[PDB]
Amino acid sequence: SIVFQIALAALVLFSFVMVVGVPVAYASPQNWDRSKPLLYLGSGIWAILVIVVALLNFLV
Amino acid sequence: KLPEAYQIFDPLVDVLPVIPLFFLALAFVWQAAVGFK
Amino acid sequence: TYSPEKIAQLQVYVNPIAVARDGMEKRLQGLIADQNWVDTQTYIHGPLGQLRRDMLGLASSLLPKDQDKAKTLAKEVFGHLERLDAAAKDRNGSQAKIQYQEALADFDSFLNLLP
Amino acid sequence: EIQRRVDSQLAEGASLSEAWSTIPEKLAFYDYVGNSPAKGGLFRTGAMNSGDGIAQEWIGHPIFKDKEGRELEVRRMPNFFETFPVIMTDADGVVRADIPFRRSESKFSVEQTGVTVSFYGGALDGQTFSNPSDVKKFARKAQLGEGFDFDTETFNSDGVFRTSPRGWF
Amino acid sequence: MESVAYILVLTMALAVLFFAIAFREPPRIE
Amino acid sequence: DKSQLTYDDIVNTGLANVCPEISSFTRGTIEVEPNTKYFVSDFCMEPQEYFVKEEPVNKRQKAEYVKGKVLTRQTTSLEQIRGSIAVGADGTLTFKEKDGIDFQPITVLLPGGEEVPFFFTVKNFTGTTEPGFTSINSSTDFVGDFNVPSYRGAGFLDPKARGLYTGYDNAVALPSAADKFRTNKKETPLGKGTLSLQVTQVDGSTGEIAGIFESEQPSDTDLGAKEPLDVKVRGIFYGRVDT
Amino acid sequence: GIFRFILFLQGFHNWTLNPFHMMGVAGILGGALLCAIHGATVENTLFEDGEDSNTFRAFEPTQAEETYSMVTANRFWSQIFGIAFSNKRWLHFFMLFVPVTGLWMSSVGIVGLALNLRAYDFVSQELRAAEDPEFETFYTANILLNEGMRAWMAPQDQPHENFIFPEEVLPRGNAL
Amino acid sequence: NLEPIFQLTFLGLIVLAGPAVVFVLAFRGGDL
Amino acid sequence: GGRDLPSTGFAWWSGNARLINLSGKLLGAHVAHAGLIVFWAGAMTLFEVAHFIPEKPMYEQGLILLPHIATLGWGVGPAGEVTDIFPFFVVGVLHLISSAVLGLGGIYHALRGPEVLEEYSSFFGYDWKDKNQMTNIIGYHLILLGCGALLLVFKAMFFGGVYDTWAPGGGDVRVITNPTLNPAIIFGYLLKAPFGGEGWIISVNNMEDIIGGHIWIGLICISGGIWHILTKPFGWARRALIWSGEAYLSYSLGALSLMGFIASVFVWFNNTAYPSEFYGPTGMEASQSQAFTFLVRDQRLGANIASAQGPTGLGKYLMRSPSGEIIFGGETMRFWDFRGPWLEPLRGPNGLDLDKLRNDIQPWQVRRAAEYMTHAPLGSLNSVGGVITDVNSFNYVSPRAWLATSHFVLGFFFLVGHLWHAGRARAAAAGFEKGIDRETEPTLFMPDLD
Amino acid sequence: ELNAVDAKLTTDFGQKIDLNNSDIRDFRGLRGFYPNLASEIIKNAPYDTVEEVLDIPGLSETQKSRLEANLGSFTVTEPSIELTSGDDRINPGVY
Numbered sequence A: 001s002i003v004f005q006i007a008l009a010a011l012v013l014f015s016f017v018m019v020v021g022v023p024v025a026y027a028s029p030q031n032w033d034r035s036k037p038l039l040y041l042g043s044g045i046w047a048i049l050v051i052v053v054a055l056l057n058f059l060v
Numbered sequence B: 001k002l003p004e005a006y007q008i009f010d011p012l013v014d015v016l017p018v019i020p021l022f023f024l025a026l027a028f029v030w031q032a033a034v035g036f037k
Numbered sequence C: 001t002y003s004p005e006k007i008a009q010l011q012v013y014v015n016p017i018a019v020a021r022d023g024m025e026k027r028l029q030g031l032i033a034d035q036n037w038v039d040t041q042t043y044i045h046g047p048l049g050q051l052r053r054d055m056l057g058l059a060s061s062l063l064p065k066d067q068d069k070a071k072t073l074a075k076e077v078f079g080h081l082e083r084l085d086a087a088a089k090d091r092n093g094s095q096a097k098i099q100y101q102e103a104l105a106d107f108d109s110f111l112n113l114l115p
Numbered sequence D: 001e002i003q004r005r006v007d008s009q010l011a012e013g014a015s016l017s018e019a020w021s022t023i024p025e026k027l028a029f030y031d032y033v034g035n036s037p038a039k040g041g042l043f044r045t046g047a048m049n050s051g052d053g054i055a056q057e058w059i060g061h062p063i064f065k066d067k068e069g070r071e072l073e074v075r076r077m078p079n080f081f082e083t084f085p086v087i088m089t090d091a092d093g094v095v096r097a098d099i100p101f102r103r104s105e106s107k108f109s110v111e112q113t114g115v116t117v118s119f120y121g122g123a124l125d126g127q128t129f130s131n132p133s134d135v136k137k138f139a140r141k142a143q144l145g146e147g148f149d150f151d152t153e154t155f156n157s158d159g160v161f162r163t164s165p166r167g168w169f
Numbered sequence E: 001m002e003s004v005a006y007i008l009v010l011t012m013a014l015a016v017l018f019f020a021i022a023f024r025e026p027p028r029i030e
Numbered sequence F: 001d002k003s004q005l006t007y008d009d010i011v012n013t014g015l016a017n018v019c020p021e022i023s024s025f026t027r028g029t030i031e032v033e034p035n036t037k038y039f040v041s042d043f044c045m046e047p048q049e050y051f052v053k054e055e056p057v058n059k060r061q062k063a064e065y066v067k068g069k070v071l072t073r074q075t076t077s078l079e080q081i082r083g084s085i086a087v088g089a090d091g092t093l094t095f096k097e098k099d100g101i102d103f104q105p106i107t108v109l110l111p112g113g114e115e116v117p118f119f120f121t122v123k124n125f126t127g128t129t130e131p132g133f134t135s136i137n138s139s140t141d142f143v144g145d146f147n148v149p150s151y152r153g154a155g156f157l158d159p160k161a162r163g164l165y166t167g168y169d170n171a172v173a174l175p176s177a178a179d180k181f182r183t184n185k186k187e188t189p190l191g192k193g194t195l196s197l198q199v200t201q202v203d204g205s206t207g208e209i210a211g212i213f214e215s216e217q218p219s220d221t222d223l224g225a226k227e228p229l230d231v232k233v234r235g236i237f238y239g240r241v242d243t
Numbered sequence G: 001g002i003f004r005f006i007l008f009l010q011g012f013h014n015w016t017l018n019p020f021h022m023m024g025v026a027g028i029l030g031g032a033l034l035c036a037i038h039g040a041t042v043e044n045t046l047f048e049d050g051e052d053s054n055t056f057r058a059f060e061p062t063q064a065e066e067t068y069s070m071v072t073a074n075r076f077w078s079q080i081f082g083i084a085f086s087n088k089r090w091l092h093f094f095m096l097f098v099p100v101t102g103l104w105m106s107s108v109g110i111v112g113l114a115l116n117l118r119a120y121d122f123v124s125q126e127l128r129a130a131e132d133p134e135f136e137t138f139y140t141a142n143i144l145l146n147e148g149m150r151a152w153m154a155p156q157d158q159p160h161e162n163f164i165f166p167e168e169v170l171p172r173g174n175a176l
Numbered sequence H: 001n002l003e004p005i006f007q008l009t010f011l012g013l014i015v016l017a018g019p020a021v022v023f024v025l026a027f028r029g030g031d032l
Numbered sequence I: 001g002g003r004d005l006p007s008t009g010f011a012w013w014s015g016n017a018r019l020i021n022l023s024g025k026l027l028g029a030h031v032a033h034a035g036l037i038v039f040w041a042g043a044m045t046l047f048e049v050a051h052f053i054p055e056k057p058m059y060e061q062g063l064i065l066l067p068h069i070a071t072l073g074w075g076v077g078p079a080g081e082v083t084d085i086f087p088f089f090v091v092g093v094l095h096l097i098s099s100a101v102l103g104l105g106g107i108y109h110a111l112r113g114p115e116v117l118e119e120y121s122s123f124f125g126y127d128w129k130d131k132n133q134m135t136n137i138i139g140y141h142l143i144l145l146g147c148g149a150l151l152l153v154f155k156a157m158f159f160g161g162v163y164d165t166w167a168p169g170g171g172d173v174r175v176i177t178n179p180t181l182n183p184a185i186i187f188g189y190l191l192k193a194p195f196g197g198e199g200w201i202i203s204v205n206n207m208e209d210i211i212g213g214h215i216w217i218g219l220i221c222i223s224g225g226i227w228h229i230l231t232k233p234f235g236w237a238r239r240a241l242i243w244s245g246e247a248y249l250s251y252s253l254g255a256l257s258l259m260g261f262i263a264s265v266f267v268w269f270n271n272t273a274y275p276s277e278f279y280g281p282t283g284m285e286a287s288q289s290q291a292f293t294f295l296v297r298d299q300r301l302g303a304n305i306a307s308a309q310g311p312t313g314l315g316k317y318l319m320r321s322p323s324g325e326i327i328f329g330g331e332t333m334r335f336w337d338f339r340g341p342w343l344e345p346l347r348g349p350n351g352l353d354l355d356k357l358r359n360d361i362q363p364w365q366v367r368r369a370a371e372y373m374t375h376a377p378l379g380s381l382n383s384v385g386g387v388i389t390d391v392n393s394f395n396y397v398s399p400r401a402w403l404a405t406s407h408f409v410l411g412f413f414f415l416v417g418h419l420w421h422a423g424r425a426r427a428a429a430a431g432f433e434k435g436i437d438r439e440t441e442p443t444l445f446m447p448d449l450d
Numbered sequence J: 001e002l003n004a005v006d007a008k009l010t011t012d013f014g015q016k017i018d019l020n021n022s023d024i025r026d027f028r029g030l031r032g033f034y035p036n037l038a039s040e041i042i043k044n045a046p047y048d049t050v051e052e053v054l055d056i057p058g059l060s061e062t063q064k065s066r067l068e069a070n071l072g073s074f075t076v077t078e079p080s081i082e083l084t085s086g087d088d089r090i091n092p093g094v095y
Ligand code: CLA
Pocket: D042, D043, D044, D045, D046, D047, D164, D165, D168, D169, G101
């Protein structure tokens, strides 16, 4: 059950990272070419973390 | 009470609902950052 | 099977179930036969007003391998009770008589499941 | 002052009626709440005689006693109060009698506590009242201080207090 | 008969309202 | 008839203030044995006409009753009353009210603007017939007496907070003139009324009875402030006799 | 504490019944009305003296002309209400006059209450209610309210007096 | 108790998050 | 787009008016805001789940969201007892996560996306003056609203049922099988008076009428959606209305104000769509509960509850309504239109029945009446329950009170907003929202009034 | 002039429990009386003397012993309708 808590703590830490990062990257027209695949990868990682939290919830 | 495997995050949930209020505050901060133009 | 103590613990629910069953046999059949639909609706709402809680508490506190059958049967009495309510609101003698008979048959099938 | 004077006469050896008869009617008239200037009204016009009436005589001093012979004093009406509950306390400040509003759970009604009243000096000197109607009426009179008989028909007095020339000035 | 006095003062106020509206000093630009 | 109607059918229509009617014009009768008690199940009483005996300045003029208009609304009916009809040895039938909604306060308006409240009631009505009855039929007249309690109870407070077992016993707004009013002393005496229930319709298949009533009773005295007026009430009635 | 003083002057002085207070209420509510109506009227009869939808920057403090139309405001209130201000100086003096006169009149009433010179009662209605127990008005109901508040409030509000009022002497209606 | 410590810490993190976004955008001259 | 006063004419305190003609940033504003609504839904649900004591009644516990979910039939059983905590948690988590998606999309369109959508696509780009596109957007959103009402119907009929407080055997989650399709009943609810005893649509007292109304709403909204996709506004509509973004905003503001008032009254009076097992008793319910509680208590002491006159001469426990119905006495005479599942078994055709009051009162009716009279929607702002003269020991304000007060206030301020935006839309379309032109001042050309 | 309940307060009604006029709340001071035995006393009122409170039909032996134990706390005066009409003996408007 500790790995589910690790998954949920990872989800909220990466959620805080995305809360800091997404409006900064969207309001940076001069760093957009670097930051757009970072935003894509962050959205994918966040979605995968949410799905993993759901699956480990039904695994616990 | 939350389900048991989520109960480690009961304090965070306890501060979750007032986050929209901060949003109303945040716009003022941003206007303060630009000079209220 | 059933510890005599467990049986003693089920009485809490059985006494109102026996009261509701005997009253459904005596008052409710006469009131449906009298075409007294106002008193039929007020009977199935007032004196039967804890039938759902008491039968689901009987089914919850029963033996764990007879719970589903119990609840299942209990839910069928309720369905017959709602259909009886609708037939009494429609002033339907035959439909309310039929729903009373189905409710009685499912109540008796529920009452055969006691230890 | 009235009590000092009565107590001096009681210390000389007089009886209660003898001591209370030496109080001048003017002095007892000053000890009446209807002569206080803080009892009037802005549109209660004219003389104080248009209020309670023309004062005719001092009725004397009441002494209220319960069935167990505890002397009781009626709590006096303060200047603030248009109306006031009738409360009677003993010598050590314990409420022994009252006039109840709700008489379902009354415990200290004049009727229940057997309160009698005896008057010394004045018009009612030497008299004792035991009817609770008269005793409650004299209790309401004792609420206002010294009791006085009033002529109300000369000026058609309406029964509410006026202020004096002191208050109007 | 105090009702007569009350009706009179209320009627005087309403009549003053009528005359103050219908026969006001007209505002003029000069 | 409002026998098959539900609450939703009757609500806000005024039909809850009217007594049930014997549909069957059956001029039948209900047989009665000479020493038996028959219960009355749902006795109803619908007043229709209201009269107050006027009080003139003259002393020897004829008094006479004047019709009044009800200011209270459809809140003027007695219903759900249980009772008993006992038959004495000589066939004297005795109606005896027991309980139910056996009272309504009713305020009527007289010509001249006088509002007459009164406590319309059938409380503890005992009413006898002439002797020699073997049944209940169209000739059964229960004539008797009922109690009229005071319109205001002893817990009522007047607009100066004076009442009987609660409130002041004096006029506290007038401190030097507090005990000079006779209205300080409230009282609630028990009055008496006369009721005639004349049966005009007997349905012997179900024991139902209907007919008319004439009633006379005092009005509200307002805790003994004023003298009561005489009120005459005529209306119709229904009951169910338990054979 | 101010709220207590307010309720105290209600139950002990019937200070709502005092015409000096009623003139104060008229003055204060009228001054609030005048503030609201004058601010709204000026802000809605403004001259277009600028290009922004922000109308606040179309004013200069050194300008000589009026920033709003007195004529349009006068016509608006003459057709809506019946009368209107035609004189700006009288408008502003009235805006001074109403709440200041209200304060002065209520002060006169408070000076009256200092000596218990109250507008407590209408003696005619009291004598009628004393002799006729069917007569009830809102004034008599308010008198009963004041009686109850005095009896229930005095022992805790004036603790130096040592008012011992037993439960049976407290005035109360049925069931409360 | 440690519950109110975490509540305040989570609240303080959430409170600093918004002004942090504003501060990094103003310090680096983003599209404010 | 201008982000300052010199380039827009709008100050900072009116900044969002700088978006009126910037459709992409407007869409991002709209979508981020929806994020916020779904965020509050999810986070408030998780808060309410975390603070929930499930053996304690929801209305004791400051919950306004779990009653909404429980009325849909999730996580509850007979008498509204909480079976499982997981459906409420699921509803919270799904809203919270989705709100993250909606917030990211609003930020995009608001900060990075194209500021105007008209040069990018004709389907999504709109001009406020283009009456065909405005009605197209109305039409898409109407088909979606009708689909939502049909989703409520599907939950009640096909996927587990809704909580029926009026169910025989006691209130329970039941599946609606015979919804009221009869348009006479459904639209006669619209024709009923908004007064006592009638109650307009607040008086809907059964789940069959509710679910049948949502079948009709779904059908009406879907048909009106196609209408407005396929059609354009007619001449009377074109000549009657103001056609601008602020005008359409103000029309929505008046609509929202009306629904806010309706919602406050609905939650204050209706115990069917707002069951008292979750929301607590209504005020009428609690007053009738007190009268019933003391009728039962004094009847147990041997009082003749029908022949008992009170101090005024009216019946102390039972009296007559103005149309004659046998009702409870005292001040609750006002509340004689109240209907509840605990009370209706004691009612006959004429009103309250003497025989049922004498020998048909069950202990659960006494328990429910005591609980409802002591959970009356009376409370202080710092949540001290009961009458305001009570002392501090009962921590309770009813969810009906909170919901009703909130929505009344919201409804009032949205009427104010309607007046402000309608008036401004009219002045801006007429050209004098910025003030009176000094040369062409209209009063200077009018004749004098007198 | 006193009203009738004041004149009753002058009598032994104002000192102890009157089986013909006392409200049910006054029976709470005797142990074992409220609510059942007091209700039976009030229902079977009036009484000519105190002693015929023991002749109520349906009294149990424990109720008879309790009534015998508290016989000195009872008085009997004439039934006054001002305290008995409208079931003021059950609910006089006092809570
Ligand atoms: C300081 C001045 C003063 C004082 C203290 C008194 C005091 C007294 N006089 Mg004398 N009196 C005076 C001046 C004075 N008087 C004058 C100038 C006259 C000649 C008119 C009289 C004529 C007179 C007569 C004829 C009688 C008295 C009597 C009395 C007694 C009763 C007073 C009474 O009922 O008043 C009642 C006072 C009021 C009800 C207050 C009224 C004040 C009004 C309502 C205020 C108006 C407010 C205003 C309109 C608001 C402005 C509006 C805003 C826009 C600014 C009392 C001892 C009476 C008495 O008993 O005689 C023996 C009597 O019969 N006096």
